[PDB]
Amino acid sequence: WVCRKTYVTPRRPFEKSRLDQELKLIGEYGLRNKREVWRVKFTLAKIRKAARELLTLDEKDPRRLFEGNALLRRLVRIGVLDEGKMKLDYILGLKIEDFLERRLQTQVFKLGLAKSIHHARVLIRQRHIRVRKQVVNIPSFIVRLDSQKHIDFSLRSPYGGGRPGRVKRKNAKKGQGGAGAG
């Protein structure tokens, strides 16, 4: 049908200081690679351009009003932006970090069963949590406000309760085959 890239490649391939900056973001927020950072760079740039367009439209104009409100509402739903600010001027001031902080991984750190921004990502990818009664396997995700009230253990990781898989049973048989000697 139709497809599109979710990331962007900048015009200078080596730019040492920037490469370091990008590595630091990866460290802080537990990411896979530069493509993860580029993924946010693509989204953020489009949001700023959206904002900037609206801001140069005439005031009290249906298009500016309707799409303004929509852009604001979306950014507040995911908890990047706060609605005590709530106009175009403030949206421009947002940066890469503000998005990353509202991801599933960084919530799984902040509460629950991760010990690091390391651990968290591996926990999500190995299906140790449900967000509600719904497993989430994607760490780069961005949870909404009231979805951070339902992050909890899964019933398909058998610690935190759940049906025995073959990893709990593996540990059982280090006591009944490792120490059972058979």
Partner: protein, 226 residues
Amino acid sequence: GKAGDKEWLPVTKLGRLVKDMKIKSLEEIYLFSLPIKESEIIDFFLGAALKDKVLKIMPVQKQTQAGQRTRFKAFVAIGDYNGHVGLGMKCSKEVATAIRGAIILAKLSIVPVRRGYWGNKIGKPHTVRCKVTGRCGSVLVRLIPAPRGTGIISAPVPKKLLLMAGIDDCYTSAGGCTATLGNFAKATFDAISKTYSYLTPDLWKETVFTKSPYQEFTDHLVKTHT
């Protein structure tokens, strides 16, 4: 180990007033448009949060009577991140000496650069209020203000100057020779300073003029001479 030292020697009214603290900032001096010929004045009012960046260390030369001769030409730029910047060029026999002199020269030349906005008016200046252009040798750099979160879109050498200038958001276009770096920095230096030289309608409102600090402090500044 090694450690610095500082000493004040006045040869002028301005040096004495600064140390006595009848002048508390460079801004007063800039307003009156009086020269600064003592590095100590800049050191005393600031002397912290002053970053010196050597832009290039490039040698040049002239031919002496018997064989060659060569010397080092250094470009140093200085500035706080609060809207004050300087540029100083010095040429000396060795690399180290050329940079050492260049730093002193850079401090002396320190000039205010006006900071303004793209269109905003709340949340404090992030760019310039007017597009300013500067030319050096047929290189022309044009600075254009940019809105927040855009960042500085410039070549590395102008970007560093803009950073110190307090312009965190800027569009640039530079046209002309791109092989030459001393010219490129100089042209950007001309541009940033030009923001004060523009008369905006927010700057129209007029003032009754200084009575000069030389005249007013005349009695004070008898120490053994006025």
